């Protein structure tokens, strides 16, 4: 089966959403330093090194530890954590619950809001009954850390880590239960300290991976890219593309339609070592080539550039075929 | 039937759409069943026909629900730990390019009114907050799970309605917020993938039932044709009474239904299939199971049908192995049901 069908015009012209934020892909973000990603990311040999299925549903862990500071539970910041490896009900991997975001935790004390955190809506729930603790509904920052619960530090390696959650605003009444469940919707927003947008999120040094995860490195002038979508932010929930407060981008390593396709069929014989599968992206006034490596990462021939490539004027996606990764991908925009 | 000079509808429905990959167009849940509706039903929101058109107010996607200019309120003189209320009039969603009837993603279900503390049965519930109309900043003391739906009579006694005309898009937190707000104007922001409210841990019947679905005037209805009966697509949807329950739970399995698989909705929105099918025909696919097979048909109005007659029993797709296109067939011919 040829990889050609993985990338069609609708995937990049409005229909395809990225595999981290589930947002509508509108840009290609070059990463000249390279990056890694495993969560909800598949390769051409039918494998993922992450812990999530290719879908956005919810994040569910039955046996964490919930806590809050002080002697009064009223209007506190709710905390929750579990150890990496303790998501033993997850058939993909037991590292973390299916859908838990692959981002290092941004610690915060309050009342200020953390910058560049993955934030989702949810609650603590009763491990024995499944009933949500209705006084704990809030927006929570989720991420990977060490040192929980008292001395939190970010980490980008799942080995020895903890999956932590902390409400960014006060809950009605906090809970201190162990065990305690966490339930959070899997489609997130980006936390910001003010109404202003921040840089694209996550930056490469924030992405959490499992041991064995291959990194994407540049090949000549061919540079790994992420797929950019306009993602809501906590500082200004009404802002979209072109906001006077700035446009907020969230990035993913793959379009989810590609991830799904890679999870359904094996493409191991499609490419020889050193090759990309190439598609041509044709715009109103030019074109570019995009390449897919056997590790599942996409590339553009943009060299050292960090400028976002706008897909607003993209007209068509057409397959080219396997090409040597040593050849510069055409960039005629 | 004749070979058509157009994109064939065959590619809209492939094996992964019904064996785990396809999600339904109301709850965004993984489709695992086909739910026959012998009495028929209507649906327009996030529903497309074979003429590239929708009568609803939502794009074929699940992102968020956003309205800048509603009215927020709560009962009594003290805002602490109240149930937060919000509403706007239908027709006021002037930021929605598809339609101004309601915000993109607002659920097409009639509001189930409630006073508290009991939780209403069969409400669409999403997570969100009230936000400041001038600045866009969320009101952080109003984050909660909210029931959303259509009603009339706000701010007075709410009455359910299934007609968008003259209606109000309303939201009410099912649990207490930290501090309510009474501002007008006030924004609403709610994530578009919902859960089903239940009063206890027990599952309820599939949601929404046909008499709960809100449509705009002119929306075509799905009516039975001979022994062929309209179907909804069923997914297992989380419920507020037991957020950990999934398929096979001892507390019961909760189904949410949609009129179409979202991959079909998307495909129908990208190309016009008016020359692919004539009125009076179904586009038919064969669904092959481990032991048996059945046909399902797609009408020009975008509704799916099965040859199940008066049966109300959900059809389990666990053992579905293959979907193969059959082609245009007379809608009067009974669709094969050999399971």
Swiss-Prot record, chain B:
It comes from the Viruses. It is found in: Virion; Host cytoplasm. Capsid protein VP60 self assembles to form an icosahedral capsid with a T=3 symmetry, about 35 nm in diameter, and consisting of 180 capsid proteins. A smaller form of capsid with a diameter of 23 nm might be capsid proteins assembled as icosahedron with T=1 symmetry. The capsid encapsulate VP2 proteins and genomic or subgenomic RNA. Attaches virion to target cells by binding histo-blood group antigens, inducing endocytosis of the viral particle. Acidification of the endosome induces conformational change of capsid protein thereby injecting virus genomic RNA into host cytoplasm. Homomultimer. Interacts with host type II histo-blood group structures antigens at the surface of target cells. This is Capsid protein VP60.
